[PDB]
Design a binder for this molecule. Structure first.
Ligand SMILES: CC(C)(COP(=O)(O)OP(=O)(O)OC[C@H]1O[C@@H](n2cnc3c(N)ncnc32)[C@H](O)[C@@H]1OP(=O)(O)O)[C@@H](O)C(=O)NCCC(=O)NCCS
Lengths: 848, 852
């Protein structure tokens, strides 16, 4: 009531294009403060040459954010960057942004400077109205709320250095209280305007060396720095990834102080800390590490650390580890808190505290550094376990402290079926975007949570993310396609194929998959009282198992049902359905006419009734002749049985006549079963005995829907009493009547996606010829493929490639969240279309 | 679940130097939008000539706020003005700011613009570091928190037009939750930089006519305006004044909208409203009036009002009254919400809704205006009763709504309490500041709550408010002084006087005062078993009552105790204490040595033991001779008895010798007059006769001798022996010693420090004369009662006033029965009578300080 977690993060920091580059610099002891001329000539107005600066301000994937180019060029680069970082942070947490649209999710952005607004409003003659909508401080929050459709609070707040952590704290209370299910929290700072650094210099706040020497005797001021950081908070119930749980957080203010408004009151800071620990059941003994503000100033460092000594150290046996991210990258003013937060969370996730720079000699006014009660993290130390504190104190006296509980959940042990292959989808703005996400999958193909999260974020509108891809994890090579999509809503068609598609040990492969095996085990309950188990048949090693015509009819249709069950579980419902032979039983299941039990028995009795009449030897053959031209040339006894295409027709009749009429047909160069002759007169013998058996199984005939196109009954009689329902009468009719397949294939619309639901994809050949050029035709199993699970997965991948959304996670047992600690970061692999590049204000745009 | 009230308010609005001028303009239908050149040449860059502007930005009482002049000149005028308005708002609510120092009181300021910061940071070569501390947006909140010592949150927030009402809403939740006992909420906007108006113009947001034609068909944009407003919220338990109770408030945000980020979503606004009424037990039927955002834009007016129609009108039988303060003064952007709030609260307080301007033809896209379900307040209508809604919606989509319950408490009946005089104090920055507050008191002298509040806020540090004053209400003429104070902490001395101070029906007057009467009735219980009641003695008509030496001793000391009890109840604890004669008994009470019972019996037995010995006729006389010169010239049997001053000494002895030594002393031209003593010779050998009989009686009354403190200076025992066994405690032994030993009074009066305040605690102020001569020139000497004054209550009050005049804080409210708060509705505003020292004028950025 209610637990609040840090779910996702991203950022741009000095010399750090994303949080991965940031971690690299932290743990590697790189100093991200630089002295180049990026923002203004170094030395200008006597300023320090050193400051923390972002690599680039010019990039922004404008069309993704609905920004036309004339506006993009007049947005605060703070905002352009924050839009990307905010998206990065939401998907970092395994969360599809669509899941939060329309919700009362809040946005709080800590921000102290609107230097671009100043620049872009300097000339009345030429300025643009829309510059306000891209630059005014309120918009730093409001444009986020607008893009993401977050209808909770949308506030830009300024408390100077504490602004971003105060934003965290405000968001935290909104979630704890119930106001908000989640919150996007931002911190931003840019160094565009030199006059600002001069004001700070003249106040005595900036060190000339341009260095935050956190805790050192040598410390003589702070280094100004840039940062764009965002973090997603959610209530625990919505989280996938969880970096940490926020145990507590508050703010107070120094109030009145004899020494002046910018003198930090260590006593009041201490007061804030004290109010948040022991009074809330949280012991200072529980802390492992505290991230101090640590700007490295003569006055403020001792105030702060001595305050820590009195509020926390005094109630502890063990030394308290202390650090400050500012030693590494300088001080990004209002973004300081979230910048530091990312250091803490990256440190926790990697198991190692990233060390401070510039700590050579403890400040002698700070007893606890000299007696070892505080221990500066000055080389990488391993994370021993414990809660974490964060200070962020602004120069006007606004103080904030937050207490974190790191997530320590470990990966599950691999089970019997983590050995399986998995499927990974991706969407993206560019080819590289998709390539990178897929590569990350390949590199962490065993991290079930990581893959589960990547799959959740892949289902996106095709307008927004026009590139898709898939790869199959857990198999020999790089099995991968990636391609651009066009935004046609591509309609989905199921084709259930007939006999001929059986084979030796089919579905031995897919029985490994728990989801498939369950649809087989449910088909077992339909045929247990009749002394047969489909599960045994599929798992059988016996060469001859499927020779028996009941073993074949039941196994063929039980596999079609399992394939339909999987396809359903991943979110595919068909726009149209078409059968061939025995496939019309499976179509009935796909249409909601037959239950599972009904359809499996309609295959058993269809097979049992034919086996028991020990009929004469018959034969069929596909032949290269049209429909009307088969009736012409067919010897007596042989009839055209299935209208596959304009060129292919399958004929049916007695073995004698058919084997002869085929050898005489090859001798004129023309294209040319179980010893049975389906869809001929031969089965009118079965008609009455079947009708009776299947009247006992299909008691309550349910209507066929518009989506299912019949192949047992021509278009002409679609309206009839027979065609209304999937009755026992409908089924018998299918057996004797011809299969009018090419008849239905005319109806398939442009750009459709056609799925051949069968244990072997026999009709691939026919469907290409029968269906429009645009349409893509996708098999699901192939006969004697080394591994059909791989095959199935690879072809689901091809469906995702079309623009239809597919979520593979339902194929495998669901992952238990929160994700384990150490689950790889997602934010750094979200890549944008930066073909771009956009205007950025420059020093000469401001007064001198 | 803690009730949150709006306790106090102040502001500067267009053409309106305070909320009274603002109310005058509202109810009078004055248009505060003007077209002069104050900020920039009107018309510049094609801008509207019209905007709402403050009369002045140049004033600020810098030293009061601890701002040195070099910094004052480089502060955002927003902040300078906000500091004054914030102070004004706290004291408006009857609340002394000192009562909130050190507390977790929060500060939230809605603010969208830092145009002064831009100006003051334009030249690197010459700019000041201090400019940041006076101009950066965070400081608009942080400097308030610094000055007032408010240690809760200190946040400057920007949601464009909704910022100040969002600040109200955030503060509201902090108080409701327990985070904060109170909160200062500000809203600020200035029009310094023309380029900003150009940006707004180019976005299509500003009407050319420079007018918010709220709800009119004609409406084509908004008028930009300035405003500095602040409001104090508290939890109910801390409030004195209560304008209204906040029943509910929330914010949401429009989110995603096809039409663009600055298109207002009436549907989402509706959603916000819906979430705050029926789900919280608040019925739309309960509203009387809703203050709409009402910027007067083609698109936004219908979105808003139709949203109101669907969220509220649809659940109402009666028409809903609607208005917008923006018709009156334009739109002050982030300060819009609190500006509108003051309209609502002023309207409520005066009993009349201030009408909109510029409403001629209803916007035809708004059905509810045409069918009468919404009724624009376009002429002044009386307030019939009901809850009030306020909308404030920012152009980036941040929406806020607050629901108010107006305060309707009425003044109690004057009833069976027949009207006493009261005392009214005031502090201020200038003479006028004090004169005005006192005048307001005089004009509302029967509003008990108003007076009680004015008294609470008068107690201030003397460094900060160097002028004080008082008046006595409820009496014949104008009893008033006002004067400047010096910042010496002036120490407070009590002088308990001796005999001679009795008189016929003394304290008949002060028995009206409940607190005094009770200290008499407690002195009655000490002497009921001995067949005497002091209350009867004071109320007695018998001319001779106080001739009897026990009637006098007990009544004199019982009144001294009651005066000490009053002085205590108004907050005065003495820095030093000094007795004379029988006064050393009362000193014991004032020092915490004697209980009330102990001290009243130590007067009874001191008097009864002298009455019993019917000793020889004796006499005393004050004489014009120094201490050592009396031992020289005194005939044997006469001794110098009391050392009153360097000039006056009272001699004591047998009637024979003293009457002769007085006629021989006038024949050498020396001052010499008899003292009326009951024919007795105090502080002579004559009382060694009483010594044993008293010591025994007083050992039965003072069972457990308690130590005298450093504060009490003895007059029965010289300085030299202050360390002794006798002087440790206020024992029976100490008391007997006083009777026989001389009274060493001028001895103690040397010790009284410079600039002290000396109170003669006696039923008549006999020693006034003596104390002036005995004590340093600086020191001020104040009586408390005077013999045969027409009315001693008036006198007492007038002299408490004179104590307040010195810089020592006195709170008269405890003398009278406590006022029940919240104050009644209509209690006069305080904010407009808080006047500052505006002698200095300060820099204000100008249009030329920005780019062109
Ligand atoms: C300082 C002092 C000289 C001033 O005396 P004062 O100004 O004449 O004061 P008084 O109380 O006498 O009052 C003034 C007038 O009212 C008269 N009066 C009215 N009511 C009176 C009353 N109840 N008792 C005595 N006199 C009274 C006086 O006779 C006097 O008359 P005058 O104006 O014609 O001279 C003198 O009060 C003094 O020294 N008192 C201290 C005596 C002392 O030390 N001990 C006494 C007992 S231990």
């Amino acid at each position: 009531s209610e637990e609040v977690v840090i779910a996702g993060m991203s950022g741009k920091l000095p010399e750090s294009e994303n949080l991965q580059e940031f971690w690299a610099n932290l743990i590697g002891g790189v100093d991200m403060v630089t002295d180049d001329d990026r923002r203004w000539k170094a030395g200008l107005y006597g300023l320090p040459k050193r400051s923390g600066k972002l690599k680039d301000l010019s990039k922004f994937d404008a069309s993704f954010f609905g920004v036309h180019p004339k506006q993009a060029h007049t947005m605060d680069p703070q905002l352009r960057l924050l839009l990307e970082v905010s998206y990065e942070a939401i998907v970092d947490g395994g969360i599809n942004p669509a899941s939060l649209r329309g919700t009362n999710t809040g946005v709080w952005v800590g921000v102290s400077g609107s230097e671009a607004s100043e620049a872009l409003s300097r000339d009345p003659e030429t300025l643009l109205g829309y510059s306000m909508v891209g630059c005014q401080r309120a918009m730093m929050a409001n444009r986020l709320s607008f893009f993401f459709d977050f209808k909770g609070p949308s506030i830009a707040l300024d408390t100077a250095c504490s602004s971003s952590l105060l934003a965290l704290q405000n968001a935290y209370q909104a979630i704890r209280s119930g106001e908000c299910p989640a919150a996007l929290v931002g911190g931003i700072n840019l160094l565009l305007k030199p006059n600002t650094s001069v004001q700070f210099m003249k106040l005595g706040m900036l060190s000339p060396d341009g260095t935050c020497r956190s805790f050192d005797d040598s410390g003589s001021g702070y280094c100004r720095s840039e940062a764009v950081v965002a973090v997603l908070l959610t209530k625990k119930s919505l989280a996938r990834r969880v970096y940490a749980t926020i145990l507590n957080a508050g703010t107070n203010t120094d109030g009145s102080k004899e020494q002046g408004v910018t003198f930090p009151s260590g006593e009041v800071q201490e007061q804030l800390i004290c109010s948040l620990y022991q009074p809330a059941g949280l012991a200072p003994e529980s802390l492992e590490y505290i991230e101090a503000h640590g700007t490295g100033t003569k006055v403020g460092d001792p105030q702060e650390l001595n305050g820590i000594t009195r509020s926390l150290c005094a109630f502890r046996q063990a030394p308290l580890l202390i650090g400050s991210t500012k030693s590494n990258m300088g001080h990004p003013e209002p973004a300081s808190g979230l910048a530091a937060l990312t250091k803490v969370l990256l440190s926790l996730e990697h198991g190692v505290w990233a060390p401070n720079l510039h700590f050579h000699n403890p400040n002698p006014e700070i007893p606890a550094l000299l007696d070892g009660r505080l221990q500066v993290v000055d080389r990488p130390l391993p994370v021993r376990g414990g809660n974490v504190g964060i200070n962020s104190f602004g120069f006007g006296g606004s103080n904030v402290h937050v207490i974190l509980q790191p997530n320590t959940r470990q990966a599950p042990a691999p089970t019997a079926h983590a050995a399986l292959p998995h499927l990974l989808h991706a969407s993206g703005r560019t080819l590289e975007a998709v390539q990178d996400l897929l590569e990350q999958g390949r590199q962490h193909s065993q991290d079930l949570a990581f893959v589960s999260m990547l799959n959740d974020i892949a289902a996106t509108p095709t307008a927004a993310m026009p590139f898709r891809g898939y790869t199959v994890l857990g198999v020999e090579g790089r099995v991968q396609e990636v391609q651009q999509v066009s935004t046609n809503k591509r309609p989905l068609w199921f084709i259930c194929s007939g006999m001929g598609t059986q084979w030796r040990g089919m579905g031995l492969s897919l029985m490994r998959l728990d989801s498939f095996r369950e649809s087989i085990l449910r088909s077992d309950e339909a045929v247990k009282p009749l002394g047969v188990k489909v599960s045994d048949l599929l798992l059988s090693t016996d060469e001859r198992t499927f020779d028996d015509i009941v073993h074949a009819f039941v196994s063929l249709t039980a596999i079609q049902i399992a394939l339909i069950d999987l396809l359903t579980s991943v979110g595919l419902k068909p726009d149209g359905i078409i059968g061939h032979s025995l496939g019309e039983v499976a179509c009935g299941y796909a249409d909601g006419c037959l239950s599972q039990r009904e359809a499996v028995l309609a295959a058993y009795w269809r097979g049992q009734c034919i086996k028991d009449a020990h009929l004469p030897p018959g034969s069929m053959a596909a032949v290269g002749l049209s429909w009307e031209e088969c009736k012409q040339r067919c010897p007596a006894g042989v009839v055209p049985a299935c209208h596959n295409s304009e060129d292919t027709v399958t004929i049916s009749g007695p073995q004698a006549a058919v084997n002869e009429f085929v050898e005489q047909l090859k001798q004129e160069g023309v294209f040319a079963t179980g010893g049975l002759a389906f869809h001929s007169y031969f089965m009118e013998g079965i008609a009455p005995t079947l009708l009776q058996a299947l009247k006992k199984v299909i008691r309550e005939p349910r209507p066929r829907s518009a989506r299912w196109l019949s192949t047992s009954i021509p278009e002409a009689q679609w309206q009839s009493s027979l065609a209304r329902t999937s009755s026992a009468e409908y089924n018998v009719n299918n057996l004797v009547s011809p299969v009018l397949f090419q008849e239905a294939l005319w109806h398939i619309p442009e750009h459709a996606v056609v799925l051949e639901i069968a244990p072997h994809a026999l009709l691939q050949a026919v469907l290409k010829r029968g269906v429009k050029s645009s349409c893509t035709i996708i098999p699901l199993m192939k006969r004697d493929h080394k591994d059909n699970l791989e095959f199935f997965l690879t072809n689901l991948g091809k469906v995702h490639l079309t623009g239809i959304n597919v979520n593979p996670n339902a194929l495998f047992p669901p992952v238990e969240f929160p994700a384990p600690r150490g689950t790889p970061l997602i934010s750094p692999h979200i890549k944008w279309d930066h073909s771009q590049t956009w205007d950025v204000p420059v020093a000469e745009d401001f007064p001198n």
